[PDB]
């Protein structure tokens, strides 16, 4: 509930899609 | 000198693709197509470019504060820092940014509504010689930046898309006197009875005849004077300059082969002088950089046609098939009178062949599957077609009840004009063919794409 | 300072699922 | 309301005019209702009587029913010319 601060909220999820399965599970398992 | 609102202007980006310049213009289609593309005007002497799909109108220009204020709720001269609203000169839809994808670039296309911050573009300078605030000058090179997407109007490598990278944009003024001619209009070739072209059920209509009666009223007798000038193409039309005669109902350019025959040959077959024409005062300057001087009235006109490649006079001989051909001297019958058409008659004509070209890609594209199995024809467009029927339903939408009785009878009158200019051209016959070709199955083909078979039929 | 350099880093280059996992092998 | 009735009826299209004998009895009642002290008392009263009508759109139900009768010399236009 503000003005154009939601615009940067979309740039961080549309310029970079999530794809986080490479990060969240596989890295801490040795 | 300086651009104002209610000005007709084109956008244009330049690319040097392997030592070859292309000054290609931004152009969107509308009425079935929601996306923009490029139009080559570099080879304007050997292939005609479109004009009515690339000219824009600057509707408004505000500050950024007042724009966000209204979104929270004469003629100005544009300033490098205002935000503008561009609308299409044909479709009447505002140019905006779309949330689709074709990276993080967004695609650029028209849309219906104007509310929200999508349809607004803040101008920007692109050199040290100009800076913020001052008035716009004609022929400048500049940047356009969306408000909503916060990106630049980029030309990529030919996806035209709103990206975070820049691209220059040459602008060029086009237009700005009632009853006088303006470069690019559609009008009637009055005799004293008008020039026509044969009806449907096909000769490819390539002849030229004079006929009489209500056939001039209908959508056959429509011709567009596409002037070779780029800047100030929508000036007044004076005697002496060349202009290709374009058919409007089918899009075939009038190109005289006085050696061979009178032809409305197709698109890329238009050279400079093989299809140019001009108007003579009798039957025997150079350039104006502006909207032109008031030359040719409408009812007070007896205009004589002459080719450029030959220089003779098209005059008719002795159905009504007085087919006119070029004579060396003619008679006193080449004093042609003129009358312009209206803005809904121009609207109805353009949307016919914009769809006629599409349904034939769905008749013969579906006649490719009329064999056993070819399966190589990808020219069976579904999303390009099943969108295009929703506009033609909304184009023929009957007017609502709760309206003013002086407004309903305006809407109901313009509705009946759209139903008559589709009757004569055989659009009623042209849809019944498409209902035939889809009534072969019972729910087909590769049934991943054409799973919308019912919704197209419905 | 939030609204700055992300307004810059759009105009800078810096799929990325291929880079983050292949660095385990390298 | 009555002057709006003849204005809405004139704005439609019928490619001629019907005979409409309500028009020929209310564009006839509306026109049979229209020595220095008298020459400005019988003048400033006439300006009030034609203000019953032209303040109620009656300068349009006689400006349209001429436009709708294209060339018709019928008894309709010869009774809405006594209202103009």
DSSP class per residue in B350-406: HHHHHHHHHHHHHHHHHHSTTSS---------SHHHHTHHHHHHHHTPPPPSSS-HH
Q: Tell whether A24 lies on the interface with C, counting CB pairs under 8 A.
A: no
| Residues in contact with D6: Cβ distance below 8 Å, sequence separation at least 6, in sequence order | D23, D26, D27, D61, D65
What's the CA gap between B111 and B94, in Å, rounded? 6
CB pairs under 8 A between A and B: 7
Output the six-digit token pair for B455: 């919704």
> What is the radius of gyration, based on Cα positions, of chain A?
14
Output the six-digit token pair for D9: 């009826």
Q: Do chains C and D touch (3 or more CB pairs under 8 A)?
A: no
What are the beta bridge partners of residue B88? Answer: B56
What's the CA gap between B136 and B105, in Å, rounded? 28
Output the six-digit token pair for B211: 């006929």
> Which residues does chain C break after (C to N > 2.5 Å)?
14
Tell me the CB-side half-sphere exposure of residue B281, using CA atoms within 13 A.
Answer: 5
Residue B105 Cα distances to B86, B165, B209, B356, angstroms: 21, 9, 51, 33
Q: Is B115 exposed, middle or buried (0-12, 13-18, 19+ CB in 10 A)?
A: exposed
Output the six-digit token pair for B406: 């002086």
Q: Which of B68, B104, B150 sits opposite A7 (nearest CB)?
A: B150
* Chains adjacent to C (≥3 CB pairs closer than 8 angstroms): A, B
Indicate yes or no: CB of D11 within 8 angstroms of CB of B405.
Answer: yes
Output the six-digit token pair for B351: 């949307």
Q: Residue B69 — φ and ψ, nearest 5°?
A: -70, -50
- DSSP per-residue string spanning B111-168: ES---SGGG-EEEEE-STT--SSSBP-TT-EEEEEESSS--EEEE----EEEESS---
Output the six-digit token pair for B33: 């197509």
Output the six-digit token pair for B11: 């956008």
What's the CA gap between B89 and D80, in Å, rounded? 44
Q: Tell whether C21 lies on the interface with A, counting CB pairs under 8 A.
A: yes
* Chains adjacent to B (≥3 CB pairs closer than 8 angstroms): A, C, D
- Enter the DSSP assignment of B452: G
Residues of C in contact with A27 (CB under 8 A): 24
Indicate yes or no: CB of A11 within 8 angstroms of CB of B68.
Answer: no
- Enter the DSSP assignment of D57: T
Cβ atoms of residues B222 and B424 within 8 Å: no
Resolution (A): 3.7
Q: For chain D, how many residues are written?
A: 84
Distance (Å) from the C-alpha of residue A1 to the closest C-alpha of chain C? 17
Q: Do chains A and B touch (3 or more CB pairs under 8 A)?
A: yes
Q: Is B23 exposed, middle or buried (0-12, 13-18, 19+ CB in 10 A)?
A: middle
Residues of C in contact with B150 (CB under 8 A): 7, 10
Instruction: List A residues 1-30 in contact with B (Cβ-Cβ < 8 A).
Output: 3, 7, 11, 14-15
What's the CA gap between B283 and B254, in Å, rounded? 21
What's the CA gap between B97 and A7, in Å, rounded? 14
Closest by Cα among B175, B185, B169 to B84: B169
Question: Which chain A residue lies closest to C6 (C-alpha atoms)?
Answer: A8
Indicate yes or no: CB of A14 within 8 angstroms of CB of B150.
Answer: no
Please report how the helices B405-420 and D2-11 are oriented relative to each other, as an axis angle in degrees rounded to 10: 10
- DSSP per-residue string spanning B23-34: -PEEEE--SS--
- Enter the DSSP assignment of B49: P
Place of tokens 């006629």: B356
Q: Tell whether D67 lies on the interface with B, counting CB pairs under 8 A.
A: no
């Amino acid at each position: 509930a503000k003005g154009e601060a939601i615009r940067i909220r979309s740039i961080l999820r549309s310029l970079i899609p999530l794809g986080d399965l490479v990060g969240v599970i596989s890295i801490a398992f040795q | 000198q300086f651009l104002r609102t209610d000005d007709e202007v084109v956008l244009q980006c330049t690319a040097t693709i392997h030592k070859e310049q292309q000054k290609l213009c931004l152009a969107a289609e509308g009425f079935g197509n929601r996306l923009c593309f490029l139009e080559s005007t570099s080879n304007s002497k050997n292939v005609p470019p479109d004009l009515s799909i690339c000219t824009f109108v600057l509707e408004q220009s505000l500050s950024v504060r007042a724009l966000q204020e209204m979104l929270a709720n004469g003629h100005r001269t544009l300033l490098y820092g205002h935000a503008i609203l561009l609308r299409h000169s044909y479709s009447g839809m505002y140019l905006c940014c779309l949330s689709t994808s074709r990276k993080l670039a967004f695609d650029v296309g028209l849309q219906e509504d104007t509310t929200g911050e999508a349809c607004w573009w803040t101008i920007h300078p692109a050199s040290k010689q100009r800076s913020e605030g001052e008035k716009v000058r004609v022929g400048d090179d500049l940047i356009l930046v969306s408000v909503s997407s916060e990106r630049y109007l980029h030309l990529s490598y030919l996806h035209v898309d709103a990206a975070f990278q820049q691209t220059l944009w040459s602008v060029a003024p086009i237009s700005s006197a009632q009853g006088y001619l303006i470069g690019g209009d559609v009008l009637r070739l009055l005799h004293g009875e008008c020039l026509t072209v044969p009806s449907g059920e096909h000769e490819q209509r390539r002849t030229v005849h004079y006929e009489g009666g209500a056939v001039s009223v209908h959508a056959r007798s429509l011709w567009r004077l596409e002037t070779l000038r780029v800047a100030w193409s929508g000036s007044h039309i004076r005697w002496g300059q060349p202009f290709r005669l374009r058919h409007v109902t089918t899009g075939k350019y009038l190109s005289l082969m006085e050696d061979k025959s009178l032809l409305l040959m197709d698109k890329e077959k238009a050279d400079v002088k093989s299809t140019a024409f001009t108007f003579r005062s009798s039957k025997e300057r150079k350039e104006v950089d502006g909207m032109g001087t008031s030359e040719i009235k409408y009812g007070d006109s007896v205009c004589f046609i002459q080719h450029i490649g030959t220089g003779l006079w098209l005059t008719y001989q002795s159905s009504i098939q007085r087919k006119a051909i070029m004579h060396h001297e003619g008679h006193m019958d080449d004093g042609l009178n003129l009358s312009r058409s209206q803005h809904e008659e121009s609207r109805t004509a353009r949307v016919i062949r914009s769809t006629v070209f599409l349904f034939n890609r769905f008749i013969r594209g579906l006649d490719a599957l009329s064999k056993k199995a070819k399966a190589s024809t990808v020219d069976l467009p579904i999303e390009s077609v099943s969108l295009s029927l929703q506009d033609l339903i909304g184009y023929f939408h009957p007017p609502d009840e709760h309206l003013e009785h002086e407004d309903k009878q305006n809407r109901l009158r313009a509705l009946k004009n759209r139903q008559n200019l589709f009757q004569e051209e055989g659009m009623i016959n042209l849809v019944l063919e498409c209902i035939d070709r889809l009534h072969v199955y019972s729910s087909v083909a590769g049934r991943e794409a054409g799973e919308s078979w019912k919704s197209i039929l419905n | 300072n939030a609204n700055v350099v992300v307004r810059l880093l759009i105009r800078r280059p810096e799929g990325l699922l291929a880079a983050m996992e292949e660095a385990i092998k390298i | 309301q009555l002057i709006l009735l003849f204005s809405r009826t004139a704005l439609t299209e019928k490619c001629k005019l019907e005979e409409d004998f309500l028009y020929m009895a209310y564009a006839d009642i509306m026109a049979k209702s229209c020595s220095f002290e008298e020459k400005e008392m019988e003048k400033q009263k006439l300006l009030y009587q034609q203000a019953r009508l032209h303040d109620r759109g009656a300068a349009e139900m006689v400006l349209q029913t001429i436009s709708a009768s294209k060339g018709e010399t019928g008894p309709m236009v010869a009774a809405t010319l006594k209202l103009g």
